Design a binder for this molecule. Sequence first.
Ligand SMILES: [Cl-]
Ligand SMILES: [Cl-]
Lengths: 174, 176
Amino acid sequence: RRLELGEALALGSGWRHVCHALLYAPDPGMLFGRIPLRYAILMQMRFDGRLGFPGGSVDTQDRSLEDGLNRELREELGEAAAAFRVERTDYRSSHVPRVVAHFYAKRLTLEELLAVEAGATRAKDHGLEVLGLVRVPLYTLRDGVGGLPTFLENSFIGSAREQLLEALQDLGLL
Amino acid sequence: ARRLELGEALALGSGWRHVCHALLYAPDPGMLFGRIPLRYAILMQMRFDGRLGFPGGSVDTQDRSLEDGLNRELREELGEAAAAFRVERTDYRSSHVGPRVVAHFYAKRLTLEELLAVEAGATRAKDHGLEVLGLVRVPLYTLRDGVGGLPTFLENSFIGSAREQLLEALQDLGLL
Ligand SMILES: [Cl-]
Ligand SMILES: [Cl-]
């Protein structure tokens, strides 16, 4: 299932790689003035009706995983994604058809993150591979179901659900 | 989700909340992977509660009609761009009733250019990042595996009867 980046960097041509990024930004915002949002975190509704992360396939044209991640993101998200670069320091995990899924996480400013939302419609893949961007609600509502717990009952691509949870875990959100 | 006629629903007493939601759609000729027809761009939204639904909201006695209230909530939910059309009584579709809420549904044909400006602008709506977590188009196809596209979309969590309201409008749009 899961493996080391070197372990997977080491692999024959019978494997290709994908790169995906969880973009996040602190948020002092408060739903209804009462419920702290904590962080804005983007996901995308994909062409198959499943929730996933931005990025995509890295191919022989790329000098590295990050060059392919950042290229995929310019195309999926638009020009606001070139305000920053995802680097190896933002890498998190690799997972295994015959595909290795690399996963990254990049802290943005709320301002940067908002610019990415604002420009996402003009992106090439908008209204095609990507049906739109959504933020992950990080709270649980007063009924004990609304919010994250219900968000987590949606359809997710691949291992995106588990990537999400691990990263939230690692943000101190359980 | 027991149904109501619009007149009856309007007759209901001072102890009911009324909500109004709108399915905004334009025809779209494009093809996914240049081979799979989109047919229409139809807007839905990810709500604060992690459920998919339609733009709209509460309507109160301070609204001179359900329509005025819907256009007001549409402006809150999606921004300036939505002011460029009014959703009127002719676009009305159905009303449903738990806790003395009545929920009214509209469907409104926009021009593809109008629908885009709505998405382009939604990041500036008051509710964006609050009640509205972002917009999404409904995928109307089913993909070669017979599960991706629409039928997987339908397995996501929906608020109220948005699934039913959606499915209803797709049927009335003539989609099998
Ligand atoms: Cl490589
Ligand atoms: Cl009228």
